[PDB]
Amino acid sequence: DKKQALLEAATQAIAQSGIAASTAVIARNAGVAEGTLFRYFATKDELINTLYLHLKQDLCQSMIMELDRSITDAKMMTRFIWNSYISWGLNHPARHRAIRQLAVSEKLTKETEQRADDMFPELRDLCHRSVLMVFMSDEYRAFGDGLFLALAETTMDFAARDPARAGEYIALGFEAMWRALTRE
């Protein structure tokens, strides 16, 4: 009756005031004290590896409930999953604007990845089969992830401000990143 208020506080804080959020305001929302948070989340990073897993879970649980488990085409499957990502993102700006710092902050662990890699078996093998091998290496994977998110968030941004073309931005955005990240 408070943990998801200490994550319903962080999301709304990381969002507005960047990875350096003021734990003071944080308390004023979940209604707790400093050590309280630290009795759920040991350190500030654990908070950032857990809040990321929290916000990731939701994003995936969202992306799975729209998976038409029947279609074959790797690109078509990637196209349908891109729709979900944009949807969740438009539905949950603050959430998305918080998962944004997290995936590009480095305060993340390598097990946090396998949590965010396995947590959706379908996209993981799909990427292995579609993404340039260079964006699958240890050295340039984060870069590849960075480009994908920057393209998704740009697509989110335009969709939200011009709702009548939204569909066209989604399709245009998807095709752009597909050429950028997959095999020719």
Ligand X SMILES: CCNc1cc2oc3c/c(=[NH+]\CC)c(C)cc-3c(-c3ccccc3C(=O)OCC)c2cc1C
Please tell me what DSSP assigns to residue 92.
Answer: -
Q: Are 30 and 6 in contact (CB under 8 A)?
A: yes
- Does the protein bind its own copies through residue 57 (CB under 8 A)? no
Give me the residue label for tokens 């949950």. Answer: 92
- Does the protein bind ligand X through residue 117 (CB under 6 A)? yes
Q: Which residues contact 148 (CB under 8 A, 6 or more apart)?
A: 177, 181
- Does the protein bind its own copies through residue 150 (CB under 8 A)? yes
Write each residue from 2 to 41 as x if it is in contact with ligand X (CB under 6 A), else as -, in one continuous string. Answer: ----------------------------------------
Residue 64 CA to residue 140 CA, distance in Å, equals 27
Give the binding range for its own copies (CB under 8 A) out of 23-31, 36-44, 54-62, 135-143: 135-143
Q: Could you give phi then psi for residue 20, rounded to 5 degrees? A: -85, 80
Q: Which residues are at the interface with ligand X (CB under 6 A)?
A: 56, 59, 78, 81-82, 85, 99, 103, 117, 123-124, 127-128, 130-131, 135, 141, 144-145, 148, 181
